[PDB]
Each structure stands twice: as C-alpha cells, then as structure tokens.
Design brief:
Blueprint lengths: L7 E2 L4 E5 L2 H8 L3 E5 L9 H9 L3 H13 L7 E5 L6 E5 L12 H7 L6 E4 L11 H11 L3 E6 L2 H9 L3
Helix pairs in contact: 4-5
Bound molecules: the ligand O=C(Cc1ccc(-n2cccn2)cc1)OC[C@@H]1CCCNC1=O.
Length: about 170
C-alpha cells in the first residue's frame, strides 16, 4: 500500500491521473519524482521549469554543479539528484526532443531508467514541449516500465484522450 490517490489503473504496474506533477509531489513526497530533463539539466520550461521553480531554483543550482563535474547526460540517459522539497530523490531522465530531431526509438531507453526504482511519480517522457505523441509515449511506458509508475498528466483534455484511447 502506498499514498498515491485518485489514479486510474491501466495495467498491473502503471497508474495515471490528471494532475499537476508539482502539486502531486508536494502532497505525496514520493521517494522518486521524475523530471523531463535535457542533457544540460537546463530546467527552463515544461515539467522541468515547473519542478525547478517549485524548488526556488535549488534544483538548477544542484544541476549546474552536477554538469560542471560530470558533463552532459546522454539522450535516453538519467541521473539521480536531490528531490529538494518535492521528493526524496529526483530522477532526471532525458527523453528525445522531437523539436531537436532526436531519434524517437530512444524513448524506450529513456523509460528503462525507471526500472531502477521500485516506485516513481512521473510525467510522460518526450510529451509536451519535447514534441512526441503522448499516446505513443504512454504505450512505450506500459511496454517498458516494470516497476510501479504513477503518471501525472497536466492537461485534462489530453488525460481524457489518453484513457479513452488506451489499449
Ligand atoms: O509541461 C508540462 C507537461 C505537458 C505535456 C503535454 C502538454 N500538452 C498539452 C497539449 C498537448 N500536449 C502540456 C503539458 O507540465 C507543465 C507543468 C506541470 C505542472 C506544473 N506547472 C507546469 O507548467
């Protein structure tokens, strides 16, 4: 039993809710919140900008030190950093950004990072300003993640479309 509330169960291990991932993280304080990161951990907009804003820019400060030490992530890769006031840990995962021409096949590799964590609160990777089809992202999530994932979808219209079209 965990504290996630109001989710629709899609599969044995994948759950979905129309929710603001920031507000959801603040309420649940999950062990792991996933950020929709880029390789530079520049949290300017989308989910990343919103999560970083909620940390009063502490996420960005920590991220800049991480990059200065380690260099950029790979597309499809991840790193574990602090969850600040939102979660114990933040798993920064880089899905391919279609508006940069990145290969969508890398979306499966991106979701594989979730399997290193037993339970996660997450957005749909490569959705939103990353330019991929969220229906495709949900399919890859379900077919790749084996650990327990609680997906937060900000847009109610998109949420309803994702549920109604889910196979
Ligand atoms: O960026 C996102 C994710 C997102 C993904 C897809 C869409 N989308 C709309 C139409 C088509 N796709 C919109 C948003 O979350 C925004 C965050 C989360 C909550 C806190 N404040 C924010 O701004």
């Amino acid at each position: 039993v965990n504290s996630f509330s109001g989710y629709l169960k899609l599969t044995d291990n994948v759950y979905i809710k129309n929710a603001d991932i920031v507000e959801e993280a603040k309420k649940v304080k999950p062990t792991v919140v996933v950020n929709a990161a880029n390789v530079y951990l520049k949290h300017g907009g989308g989910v990343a900008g919103a999560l970083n804003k909620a940390t009063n820019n502490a996420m960005q400060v920590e991220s800049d030190d991480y990059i200065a030490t380690n260099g950029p992530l790979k597309v499809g890769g991840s790193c574990v950093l602090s969850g600040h006031n939102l979660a114990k840990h933040c798993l920064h995962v880089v899905g391919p950004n279609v508006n940069k021409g990145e290969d969508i096949q890398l979306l499966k590799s991106a979701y594989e990072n979730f399997n290193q964590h037993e339970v996660l609160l997450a957005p749909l990777l490569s959705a939103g300003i990353f330019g991929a089809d969220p229906i495709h992202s949900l399919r890859v999530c379900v077919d790749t993640v084996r650990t327990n994932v609680y997906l937060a979808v900000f847009d109610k219209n998109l949420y309803d479309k994702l549920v109604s079209s889910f196979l």
